[PDB]
Design a protein around this ligand. Structure first.
Ligand SMILES: Nc1ncnc2c1ncn2[C@@H]1O[C@H](COP(=O)(O)O)[C@@H](O)[C@H]1OP(=O)(O)O
Length: 169
């Protein structure tokens, strides 16, 4: 099985592109963890084939759940693909590491709060994806990860990246 990246970074750009996810990306690189972090402007109807391919060629995914993650149908389609690989891929598997960035993990797990609010903005053309999206969020939120709240963020990122390093080896 081809492996190009150690980590695929899933995130909601409008929330975290310039700040937390950028600092996390550079911290992973400083540990020699080959990371895919999209910085292209995406305006296609569907998920870009470059992204689907990067997920398939990653040893793991890190998910930066943030307040508006579920308001993007592209983030949710990304998550479904990640959780599909988590179930199917082998030699090696595809590990998943969720970060709950200033969001309650149970809100992700149960689609409450802003994660429940998000689904009201999806019309009937997405009706068939909504059950898969909910399933992927619940599965992801049950995996062991890191709830982040207010506190010194450089030390938060240091502990996360140290933990990913030890779990990949
Ligand atoms: N084709 C697309 N692919 C991925 N994300 C998109 C796409 N179109 C819109 N988005 C996301 O939805 C937001 C609102 O778009 P618009 O105002 O044009 O309706 C964009 O800033 C972007 O959020 P993000 O940058 O967090 O990925």
């Amino acid at each position: 099985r081809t492996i190009t990246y150690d980590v695929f970074l899933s995130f909601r750009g409008e929330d975290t592109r310039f700040n937390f996810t950028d600092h996390l990306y550079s911290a992973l690189g400083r540990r020699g963890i080959r990371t895919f972090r999209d910085d292209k402007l995406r305006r296609g109807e569907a998920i870009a084939p470059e992204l689907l391919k990067a997920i398939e060629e990653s040893r793991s995914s890190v998910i930066v759940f943030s307040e508006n993650y579920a308001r993007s149908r592209w983030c949710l389609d990304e998550l479904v693909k990640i959780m599909e690989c988590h179930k199917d891929k082998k030699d090696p598997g595809h590990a998943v590491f969720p970060i709950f960035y200033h969001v309650d993990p149970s809100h992700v797990r149960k689609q409450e709060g802003s994660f429940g609010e998000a689904f009201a903005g999806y019309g009937e053309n997405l009706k068939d994806k909504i059950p898969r999206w909910r399933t992927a969020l619940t599965e992801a939120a049950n995996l062991s990860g890191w709830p982040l709240q207010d506190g010194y963020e450089s030390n938060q990122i240091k502990e996360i990246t140290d933990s990913i390093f030890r779990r990949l080896k």
